[PDB]
Structure formats: C-alpha cells, structure tokens
C-alpha cells in the first residue's frame, strides 16, 4: 500500500557522452544510457533522474547557475529539466544529430554542434511560467565543410572556438557588431582538430589535433595577425588524442588518448605534470572541476567513470559497471548493501547509502547464475555456470570455500539453510538437487525426485523446509533435517519458473508459464490463492516479429518473483517491459511499472544471427527495510523507493485532528496526545516536530502510554530516521524506553515488528557501534601512554 518511484541506477555508472562537473564542483553529472546520473562526491551519494529520453543520451550540459540541465539524444531530441526540482521543463526536437551542447558562461545562450553547422540559441527563463515555445535561435553559423568535433566558449560570452575534421580551428563572435573582431580560421594541423581553447586573458588560442600536436596562437606583428609562435608535439608511439579539455585559471591540459592513457600538462611550458594509464580502452570523455583540482575521465567500452585529484594524487570516485546484464541480485539481511551478479561471471558488492561498488570478485569463470545471503549476513554464496558454488565471507572479503559436483554439474539456482550449514543448488541438466555441508565442503547427499530440471530453490527462514520447483509440472517439499526424511509433492498446472517463500515459512507462491502466481500452504500442501498475470503483462513487438504483439506468446509469464517482508505483496518480473506489484491476500494488481522506454531495446514498443538487445528483468527482490525494491535488468539495477512520501494517507483521522491542534497540544505540554495526533495525520514533518520537542524526562512516560496500534509505526520511524540523523543519544533513548516498556509485546508478535526491529538494529550496529569502537579505543589508547614509562 505504498507508492514506489524510481530513485537510482546501480551496477552501472557510465556508458558514453560528455561528463560535466557541477559549477559548485561538489557534484558530477554522467549520462547513463537512456538516463543521466548525478554523483554527490562530497556527500558520497548518488541519484538517477526519473525522466527518460527516447533514445540513448549523446550530449549534456549544466549551466553555471545550476538551474537548467540540457540533454540531447542521438536523434537530436532535447530535454530541458530543472536541476534543482528534478522535473522536466520542455521537450524539443532539433532534427539533427547534435555532437556537443554547451551553455554560455553568462547562461543566456547555449550553442549546439550540429554536423558542419553551429547553432546558437537563447536559454529559457526558469523563473517564468512554463512557456510553450521558449526556444528562440539567436543565430546559425556554418563555414566548416565537415563535422564539428567540439566547441569552446570565451569566458566573456563574446567569442566561440569550434574545431572540425577540416583540420581547422575557427573562431566566431556571438555579437554581430563584433564580427570583425573574430572571423578567423586557424589552419596548420595535419589531422582532425580535437580542441580549441582560450587563455585566461584570452590573448592566446591553443589548438590540439588528433595526431598529438598542440599549437600556440598569438597575435603579433610580422600589420598584426594570428601566428603559431610555439609548437608542442605529443610523442605517443601510436596512441591518438581522443578528448581534450583546458582550464584557463590554472593552465591545466588534460588529454585522453585512444590507447587508454592520459597526460596532464602545464601550458605554455609543456611540463608533463603526470601521466597515468586508464586501461587498454579509449578515454572517451574528460572534464575539469570549476576550481581545477578534480579531473573526471570516461571510457565507454567498459562503462568507466573516474574522478582524480591530481593535487594530492588521490581518487575521489572509482567505480565500474557490469559489462553484461545483471543476472541476479541479493540484498544484505539488514539492507545496507546489495550484491549483483552478471553474465560475465563477476560478482560486485554495492553500498545502498553511497551507491558505489565496495568490492568485486573475479573467481567465477563463467556466468554467476544466483546469489544469496545467509540469515546472519556475514557470509554470501553464489552459483555459476562454471560448475562451482562459492561461499564468501563479507567481513574479510575472501572466498573461504568452494563447492563443486563430481561431474561438473551446471548450476542455475542456489539456496542456503537459515543456520548457514547446508547449501543446496539445482541444475537444468541433472534433474537433481546437490546438497553440501558448509563447514566440511563435502557432498552430504543428492536429493532425487524431479523428472524435470530444477528451476528454483528456497529454504524457509523459520521452519527450514526446502521447496523446489521444476519444469516437471510439480513442486516438492523436502524435510531434509531430522532423523527421517519426507518429501511432499504438489503438482502444478504448468511449468514453474520462479518460487518465493513466506518469511513466516507457512506459504509459498510460484510463477508458472501460463502467467499464474499460485500460492500453496506448506504444511497442508493445498492451494490457497492464485492470481492471473497474462493480461497485466506488457510485451512490445520486436522489430523482426512477423506476428503481432497481442497474438505473440513470447513472454507473458514472470521468470522472477519475490514477497514483501510484510507478507501482503508480490513483485513479479520476467522477459518483458513490465514489473507488476500484486497483493497476495486479496489477489489484485497494486501497480505496474515500465522498466524502460528506449526503442533501441527490442521489446520496449542464413548463417548470421539477427540478434539485438532485449528489455527484461532477471531478478527482483524487496529491500529488507520495506521501503524499496530492486529489479535486475539489462541496463542495470533499478531501485524503486517510497522515500518522497508526498502522498497524504491519514490513519484514524478525525475533525478534531489538525496540524495546528497538534502544535497546540505541544504548547500545552500534552506530548502523548501530540505524538498520537501527528501519527494519525501521518505527516513526517509533523511526526518529526513532536519527536524532538518532547523533553528527555518525559520520554519514558510517553513511551509507556503509546497505544499498541501506533507502536510498530513509531519504531519504524525511529529506525529510518536514526540511520541518517545526528541525534544518536536522543534517538537511542527512545529505543530504550520503547523496548523497555513494550518489549514483551514485541516478543509476543515478532513478525508484526520484524521490519521495524530490523531497521533499528541496522542503525545501532552500523553507526552507533562504530562510534563507541573509536571512543573505547581512544580511552584505551589514552590509558597505555600515561601509565607506561617514557623511553629513556
């Protein structure tokens, strides 16, 4: 009963285009395929904009004011968005492939590099009401005879330097009156000109060619004309210049090459400040910070985005996205971290708060099919198409054990006992479930009974029963633990593809080929529910289909399903353009999401395989925090969250309940009534206001008197608020009073508070415990020095 919205894209940082630093220099804007992602370097946070282009992004630019962001795809279709409010402003089609877009430093105008044509336009006023036809073109310029590589602005918004493949660097004047000042074409280079820049005084013009030659241009008497006073050459053995940028204030030259290295130089002395190698793949894009101390670099082949602090030779940001599509994902039990697996065979660990890759694992040779955590969370397990199952310790980040079958069985699914002592995997070729022992590393036994490939596996969290699903049209319930082993088969209408186990461990839902999510009672082994999915699923006709989408039967089933931790919802996904969120007890569609809107993805709308990318979700799990869910797709990890909470959902509201009345109760010192009335309104700002304004003395009195119905909601509020809040001692005192006063009620009903309790332990374990660890170490680091005798 919550509204989920797209928040950020994980597993993925950069594809192509030009990286742009925010004017403040504390944020980095990177185009991510069909969307654009922003990374907060100072705060170590990231978000991906909700708006989506028709095709992949080609060029972007942010104005110095930080209010207007312009993005253009490969078709020339531009999207203007308010950077601050993250809302789209206007949609325009330039009807041409725009190589580069750059705002004027004054901000009134922005220039477009279009083929051999330079277009200069007027920037709309954000303060004005949303205008229907705000784009008016200031002028259009064309002297080049070939495509423009790039353009550069003068610091004074009066002249533009443009470089093309005509082996010429050429200048304009933004003002018609000032045309006589700057109407020169600079020549001399032997290959394509990559970048033309002004000096800080603008007296000098530096032009760089693809061959690796930098020409210094100065006005001089031979009466006065531009001449090349100095020539510098980059003596790269074969590397060609790929991208160049310049910072007039500090005189820094950053050049990215095709060989995958870059060099930093101080002009006009041509002093090599530093040379490092970015890899074997070309350095596609380069940018400089406003201050000039941070350098952002980008290579398209491996999805590469790096930020370098050349001052201290330190790395601000260093993150890689998956080369292939992510095949599976798994959350940590607390939800602080998420692990992703790709078809390459590499596993990556990602931090939800920062959104950055903490670690990567390269041990698996082939594609990693499934990833899962133990209940405790210290250990992680993964299965791969190399024929091995590997266990990972995520405190020291080591593969402490590896598992494999006798004949190298190919594994596609994996399940782990809650005790973390038994691991079971399934295969498409063997029809058998291999069982191992975690501690010893041997094959305990093979669970036989399926006449078809095992499609999915899962251990009940509480009861520890194993439920297995297979294309053999049935589901088998294994009581492996105990003196005697029993198997209870429940036959199913059609081929089962995915399986989800209730956190209670009392029920199991399964998605079948017919497009049905059937829910069975584990103890009684009888059906209790069923939901139709055929109609709700959205599948787009692929470009090569000779049969219509409505008649098509390619994918109207869900290949992945998971439960909500509360237990009343199912999120389902498959080889389609839809994620559907259903409600289990009453069997409807709560809401549906469109995973992508790019035409280049096939499903959005004789010896050679016609073979192109398709839109799909491989796996979808709920966040244990019960505020977000992640979907693994080709583009990357799409995390949809409920954080904004703009919606108004009062609970048990009455006429007497009002925000003003709640404040009046606070002024009258009726803290208990104010807190209850605020929670009835369900407004976070009012829920927050009452929360601090109560004194510490009155906390135990209020906590003991909270109604039981509001208890789970206050505990959830504290846990999510405390994770990022600064009032550690204040928030803890609430956790003391609530647990002390209502702790017995929590024990009686563990599952009602399961999510709220978990959020609390995350706060106290991941930040509160760390603070005391430093505090005690300083206390002990204190004591040794004073008591110990000083050296002679």
């Amino acid at each position: 009963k919550s509204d989920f919205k797209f928040s950020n894209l994980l597993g993925t940082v950069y594809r192509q285009g030009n990286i742009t630093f925010s004017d403040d220099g504390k944020q980095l804007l990177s185009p991510v395929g069909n969307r654009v992602s922003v990374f907060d370097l100072i705060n170590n946070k990231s978000f991906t904009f909700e708006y989506e282009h028709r095709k992949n992004i080609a060029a972007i630019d942010l104005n110095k004011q930080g209010t207007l962001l312009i993005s253009i795809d490969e078709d020339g279709r531009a999207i203007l968005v308010n950077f601050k409010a993250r809302n789209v402003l206007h949609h325009f089609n330039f009807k041409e492939k725009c190589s580069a877009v750059k705002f004027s430093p004054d901000g009134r105008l922005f220039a477009l590099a279009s083929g051999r044509f330079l277009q200069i336009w007027k920037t709309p006023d954000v303060n004005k009401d949303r205008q229907f036809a705000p784009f008016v073109r200031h002028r259009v310029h064309a002297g080049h005879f070939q495509d423009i590589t790039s353009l550069t602005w003068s610091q004074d918004s009066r002249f533009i330097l443009t470089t093309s493949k005509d082996l010429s660097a050429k200048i304009w004047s933004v003002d018609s009156e000032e045309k006589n000042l700057a109407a020169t074409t600079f020549n001399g280079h032997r290959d394509y000109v990559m970048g033309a820049f002004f000096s800080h005084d603008q007296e000098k013009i530096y032009t760089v060619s693809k061959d690796g030659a930098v020409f210094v241009w100065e006005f001089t008497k031979r009466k006065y004309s531009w001449r090349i006073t100095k020539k510098h050459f980059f003596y790269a053995n074969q590397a060609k210049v790929k991208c160049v940028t310049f910072h007039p204030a500090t005189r820094l030259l950053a050049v990215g090459f095709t060989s995958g290295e870059f060099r930093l130089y101080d002009l006009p002395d041509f002093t090599l400040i530093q040379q490092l190698s970015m890899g074997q793949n070309p350095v596609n894009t380069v940018s400089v910070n406003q201050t000039g101390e941070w350098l952002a670099f980008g290579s398209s082949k491996l999805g590469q985005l790096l930020v370098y602090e050349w001052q201290s030779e330190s790395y601000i940001l260093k993150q890689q996205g998956h080369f292939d599509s992510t095949n599976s994902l798994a959350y940590s039990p607390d939800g602080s971290r998420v692990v992703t697996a790709s078809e390459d065979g590499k596993i990556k660990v990602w931090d939800i708060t920062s959104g950055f890759c903490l670690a990567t694992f390269e041990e698996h040779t082939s594609s990693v099919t499934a990833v899962q955590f133990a209940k405790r969370g210290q250990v992680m397990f993964s299965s791969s198409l190399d024929g091995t199952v590997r266990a990972w310790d995520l405190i020291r980040y080591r593969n402490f054990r590896t598992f494999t079958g006798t004949e190298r069985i190919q594994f596609n699914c994996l399940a782990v006992d809650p005790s973390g002592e038994v691991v079971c995997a399934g295969s498409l070729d063997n029809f058998d479930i291999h069982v191992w022992s975690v501690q010893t590393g041997q094959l305990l036994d093979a669970l036989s009974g399926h006449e078809g490939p095992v499609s999915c596996l899962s251990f009940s969290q509480e009861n520890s029963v194993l439920a297995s699903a297979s294309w053999d049209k049935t589901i088998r319930i294994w009581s492996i633990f105990g003196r005697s082993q029993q198997v209870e088969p429940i036959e199913v209408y059609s081929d089962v593809l995915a399986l989800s186990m209730r956190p209670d461990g009392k029920e199991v839902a399964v998605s079948t080929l017919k497009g049905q999510i059937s829910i069975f009672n584990i103890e009684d082994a009888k059906q209790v529910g069923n939901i139709d999915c055929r109609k709700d699923i959205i599948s787009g006709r692929f470009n090569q289909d000779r049969f219509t989408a409505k008649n098509s039967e390619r994918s109207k089933f869900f290949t992945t399903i998971h439960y909500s931790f509360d237990g009343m919802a199912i999120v389902a996904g498959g080889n389609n353009n839809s994620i559907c969120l259903y409600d289990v007890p009453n069997e409807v569609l709560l809401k549906r999401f469109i995973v992508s809107r790019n035409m280049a993805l096939n499903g959005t709308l004789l010896s050679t395989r016609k073979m192109r990318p398709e839109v799909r979700v491989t796996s979808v799990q709920f966040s244990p925090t019960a505020n977000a869910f992640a979907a693994a797709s080709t583009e990357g990890l799409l995390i949809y969250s409920t954080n904004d909470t703009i919606l108004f959902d009062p609970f048990d509201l009455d006429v007497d309940v009002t925000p003003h009345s709640t404040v009046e109760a606070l002024r009258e010192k009726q803290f208990l009534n104010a807190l209850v009335m605020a929670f009835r309104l369900n407004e976070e700002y009012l829920i927050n206001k009452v929360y601090e304004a109560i004194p510490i003395k009155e906390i135990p009195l209020v906590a003991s008197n909270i109604p039981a119905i509001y208890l789970p909601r206050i505990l959830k509020f504290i846990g999510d608020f405390a994770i990022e809040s600064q009032h550690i001692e204040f928030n803890l005192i609430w956790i003391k009073a609530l647990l002390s006063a209502s702790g017995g009620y929590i024990n009686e009903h563990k599952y009602l508070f399961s999510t709220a309790m978990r959020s609390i332990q995350r706060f106290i374990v991941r930040v509160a415990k760390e603070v005391v660890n430093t505090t005690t170490d300083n206390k002990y680091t204190y004591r040794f020095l004073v008591s110990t005798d000083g050296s002679m």
Binding site: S154, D156, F159, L181, A182, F198, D201, Q202, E203, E218
Partner: peptide
C-alpha cells in the same frame, strides 16, 4: 591587442 582580449631573481650559486 588581440581583438578577443578582455575589455629579485635569486642567484642559484651558493657556497658549501
């Protein structure tokens, strides 16, 4: 000026 324009030496010899 260009049209696009805006608008002691310490000796290194030391004894040892």
């Amino acid at each position: 000026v260009a049209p696009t324009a805006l608008k002691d030496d310490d000796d290194d010899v030391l004894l040892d």
